[model samples]
Target: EMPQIETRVILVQEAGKQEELIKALKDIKVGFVKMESVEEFEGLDSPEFENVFVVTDFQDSVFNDLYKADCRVIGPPVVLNCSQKGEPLPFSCRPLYCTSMMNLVLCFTGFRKKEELVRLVTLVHHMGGVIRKDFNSKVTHLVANCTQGEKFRVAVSLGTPIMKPEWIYKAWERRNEQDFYAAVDDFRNEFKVPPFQDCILSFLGFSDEEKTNMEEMTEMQGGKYLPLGDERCTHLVVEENIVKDLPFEPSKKLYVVKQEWFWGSIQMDARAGETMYLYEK
Candidate 1:
């Protein structure tokens, strides 16, 4: 899918340099949104209008050009619209903006296939998650071919969770609201029919990092990730130490436990509770 640009209102404050500013806007790239006159606005335009700009998904080259010209360019919500009938502008969005609410920090250090890289990054944006080129504290997840890459090392050092490729496919399938740390290929919805030995699950209280690890374990063994609202699931993994207000019904006969259980099980190739990574009450 094509990445959409912001459709917002721009405030360009050019007291009397209207003509020069209009020409200035026209001088920039094709992506520049139109309607630069303050008079173009009905009431929202500053009655003491200067150069009001309406943006309809364009680039920022003109914005900087205006700033260089020493104009008070008050860029409120964008209010310009730009279009082209031809091949279409080809460019990737900059990580210039990240919102905390999305809680998505993704780093594709070494994607297996070129399409995988593109599709995964596209998935992040499409699903409302933020994508950063590099990994850091802000990054919530890291995708790597192996746990030996630079990004994998960095993620490990930060106690971040590193995930496998299945995670990306799962996220894409789930619209970016991935259920487990990483995505597994074995979740079958048996309620209306899902998975059995290959369970489907979601997470809570676990860091974005740990979730990646969990996802790997589940999917590596043919398990799967299941968001809430699913009728039935094979397991529900939660963080052991993290306190959560879990309900009694869904978790009753259902095999509910901490993420470590799944991680340990993955490591031991059996039930994790029998090992050092036992679940504590």
Candidate 2:
């Protein structure tokens, strides 16, 4: 069977050559060509410059020809980031942005559209990194379109950073190319066992599933886990009402992230190492 293939992309850095580029791509019988003129962002004044998108399942010989033909090109790499998934952001609806070093990366395309991977290929191109098909120690990221993809959990097991693909689109909004690169995770601080010891953690307003999940995970980590009505607990994880009418230490620390918080700790614990002091939100 033919290997499931990935597209080769080229960006038009030298403007006014889009037409010339299209003709050249057509002549070479490339698999596809899609061009996008620069457009305005939803919330910000920043707009993208006009760009040309090309996809080929063929060889690099055509790419070399483009280079030889004086085509100033960008859009490089397998594509690391792709698709939109997970919790919608609390702020703007644009994809997530970055400020981290993410040179080597890999992608696991899931239930999202095929076009998703193509978009990432462009950004990785500009960032000057390659997206490998296989996972390894050298790769800094695993862009899982959603949690269900197989590689998503694998990366978590390996402790490789896995994030949403929208992060790249958000990075494109910023003029700095480095913003698209993967941000190094300081999960060690989040993973550290300091907060787990002696801190009495309780749940408020969670469904039975959330409450139970937190209790089990907290206890596993040596954290003090208590039910909502328990009088002995010190910290409460909750969907809170900030009206100032209730219990002691009614902290802003209560948010919906308890499970991911504990899940990574489990990942951290096995390896022997951990901030997310209180709440990371």
Candidate 3:
């Protein structure tokens, strides 16, 4: 759960600057109970310390003393280097001098209701979690209500966890224990070879990014993707306008098709029929 800063005291170390700290808090529009120096503040577990934010640099005795007292310690990022020296800060210590959901890279799909999707997207952004439009290598979790879609396929292939929107809601409620929400259960087996089995794919006339996406999808789903040089390619995925720049004459069983065919196959989880997509004059 997020703290209510309006009702909480902000504790500044006695030796640290106060005017700058107070001005920084004011600039951010943060409401607080009051600002107090920590000269008389003994690091102890009590209601007085329980609801305080301690602005202090990391120190072995002071950090641990404040740590055990159940106070959140905010410090400069470099404080982690000097204080820990390869060791990690305590769980209560957040060295960034700020708090936000900086740990997650989330993607969402399969929402039947657009309103729910919009609300969830807004909530995640407000809490500082990243939202992605597509499922790529960086997607840490796939939030979805159903099992079918292009994003779901890519996420399943990448072994990314498929979670429900409830995970986000619950995680937001219990900000400190975001990991408590487990991924939604899915029994479908990850099909590796069945979709593109026996297919050796070669690409032509596509951008580097587009070609890379296709190549990775092909290989990950058990098809062989050739970068350059013909080696008995079973399928040729080519752009339509550049069809005339043929490297070799079309031959029997070459199965030359537009790039759509390869992507269609990936989505359908089966080799798409070549009759409609086959290259022709």
| Per-residue lDDT of candidate 3, residues 1-281 (tens digit) | 34422333354554145454444444444433333433445533345333445455445355556557656655432222323233222233332332234446788777788898877765554344567776678775444435445675566546566565665555445333322222323311231224566678888898899888888888887678775556678878889886666777655767788878877877766556677797877
Give lDDT for model 3. 0.55
Candidate 1 lDDT (Cα, 0 to 1): 0.44
Q: Please give each candidate's TM-score.
A: 0.30, 0.36, 0.33
lDDT of 2: 0.43
Q: How well does candidate 2 score on lDDT at residue 105?
A: 62
lDDT for each of the candidates? 0.44, 0.43, 0.55
lDDT of 1 at 85: 16
Query: Each candidate: how many clashes?
Result: 25, 9, 1
Consecutive 10-residue window with the lowest summed lDDT within model 2 = 83-92
lDDT of 1 at 52: 28
Candidate order, TM-score descending: 2, 3, 1
Candidate 3 stretches greater than 4 Å from native: 1-188, 191-193
Candidate no. 3 TM-score: 0.33
